Amino acid sequence: RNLRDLLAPWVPDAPSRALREMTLDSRVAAAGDLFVAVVGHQADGRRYIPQAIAQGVAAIIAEAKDEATDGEIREMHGVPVIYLSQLNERLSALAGRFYHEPSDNLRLVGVTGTNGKTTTTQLLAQWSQLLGEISAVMGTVGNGLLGKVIPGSAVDVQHELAGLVDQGATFCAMEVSSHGLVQHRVAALKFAASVFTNLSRDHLDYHGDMEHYEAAKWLLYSEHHCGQAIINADDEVGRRWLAKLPDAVAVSMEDHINPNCHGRWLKATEVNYHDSGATIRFSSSWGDGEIESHLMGAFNVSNLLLALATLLALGYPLADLLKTAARLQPVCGRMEVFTAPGKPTVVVDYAHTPDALEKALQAARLHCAGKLWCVFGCGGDRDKGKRPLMGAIAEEFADVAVVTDDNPRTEEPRAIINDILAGMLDAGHAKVMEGRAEAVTCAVMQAKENDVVLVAGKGHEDYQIVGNQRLDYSDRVTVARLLGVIA
């Protein structure tokens, strides 16, 4: 790491200086560092140049706006200060070079969209690893090699990706937020593939607004190295973009592939939602097949198909993907299915809002031949508004609502339950059982073999907050033990 080499693409004259780390934060800027002084929203890093110098940074790269011309090399207390125009725009490229282009030394797949990013990223990372990659993820859950994900500027992105390259990662599945993209946080990453789960947002009913939003996004897209484009054709915006991208892969489970285009495509032709997952029959430009997914609900069929289409597009052989699909697992505590011979199917999901609970129940219903049970409660000492809404949802979308406790904290547990019941048309038809473990047990032990019990609100969280006490408790463990299986 040398300032002169770092800057060679942009500034030919730059002085030679050994550099340690690259940081935007003057507070942590230490001896030998490159401090990068940016102008942000109500913050100007140039103000902190004297501090950084006093802390012994080897060099500084600074926003040129108002202060200097692009490429201008100055010197303050024997420290080179190099000014660059549009530094925010170029920060990704700058950090990329500094960290030896990590995205050129592994297969990076970006996933964008409002929903399904985490799941699709997890599936990409899992499936690629099943086929022999050392895979990693970067997303909302955290960053790391698979099974080692620990819970962010353009510099942080490149640095983290370099970290992963150093740990041996050959594949990385990255969640890309709309906000990250707009702020040029992934501007210089070489994506092998970019996956769109959707491109549809609220607040775009005026066609001028839809046009500006789309224009902004198309502009951003055109500036990035997206690689193979894999787009969900079941999304309306998805379809519009597919019409403009003859090389993009169209993915559908709802009959939106237009075969006249002769493009690359992948479509589920039939899905059987059953008591332990989904059997997905599909055709594609790569060949046809049948996958046994152990994920639940229609949305996860879509996510799986997107990951499949992506890996096919990257050249992973269909036969090997088919042979490994049954090993794909859900994100822990996300529509995570528990089955045991001759017992009801039990799904653990973290759904703890009206919208999430509704979606979870609708997903569970697809796999449910008998009655759908919903075991849930609401957090105490928190916003109470969702309580009757969750009651109404449980009553509507389940056949049996079992209302119980879920982190009652210092609030009277029964009072929370009463607020839930208040939301129902027929509270008397709900079952109430206090002690969460007892409520779970009640549903699981009474439910028929062909029933499904959704246990909602905790997912992977292994505690029940009663009073001030963080009591050891797991829905997953409770369910596993009742079914005689292992969590």
UniProtKB/Swiss-Prot annotation:
Activity regulation summary: Activated by potassium phosphate.
Enzymatic class: ligase
GO cellular component: cytosol
Gene (name only): murE
Subcellular localization: Cytoplasm
Similarity comment: family membership: Belongs to the MurCDEF family. MurE subfamily.
Post-translational modification: Carboxylation is probably crucial for Mg(2+) binding and, consequently, for the gamma-phosphate positioning of ATP.
GO BP terms, alphabetized: cell division; cell wall organization; peptidoglycan biosynthetic process; regulation of cell shape
UniProt EC number: 6.3.2.13
Catalysed reactions, semicolon-separated: UDP-N-acetyl-alpha-D-muramoyl-L-alanyl-D-glutamate + meso-2,6-diaminopimelate + ATP = UDP-N-acetyl-alpha-D-muramoyl-L-alanyl-gamma-D-glutamyl-meso-2,6-diaminopimelate + ADP + phosphate + H(+)
Keyword field: ATP-binding, Cell cycle, Cell division, Cell shape, Cell wall biogenesis/degradation, Cytoplasm, Ligase, Magnesium, Nucleotide-binding, Peptidoglycan synthesis
Chain location of the short sequence motif Meso-diaminopimelate recognition motif per the record: 406-409
Cofactors: Mg(2+)
Pfam families: Mur_ligase, Mur_ligase_C, Mur_ligase_M
Amino-acid positions noted as binding UDP-N-acetyl-alpha-D-muramoyl-L-alanyl-D-glutamate in the UniProt annotation, renumbered to this chain: 24, 26, 41-43, 177, 183, 185
Protein name in UniProt: UDP-N-acetylmuramoyl-L-alanyl-D-glutamate--2,6-diaminopimelate ligase
Binding site for meso-2,6-diaminopimelate: 382, 406-409, 457, 461
UniProt keyword annotation of Protease present: no
Free-text function comment from the UniProt entry: Catalyzes the addition of meso-diaminopimelic acid to the nucleotide precursor UDP-N-acetylmuramoyl-L-alanyl-D-glutamate (UMAG) in the biosynthesis of bacterial cell-wall peptidoglycan. Is also able to use many meso-diaminopimelate analogs as substrates, although much less efficiently, but not L-lysine.
Any one GO molecular-function label of the UniProt entry: UDP-N-acetylmuramoylalanyl-D-glutamate-2,6-diaminopimelate ligase activity
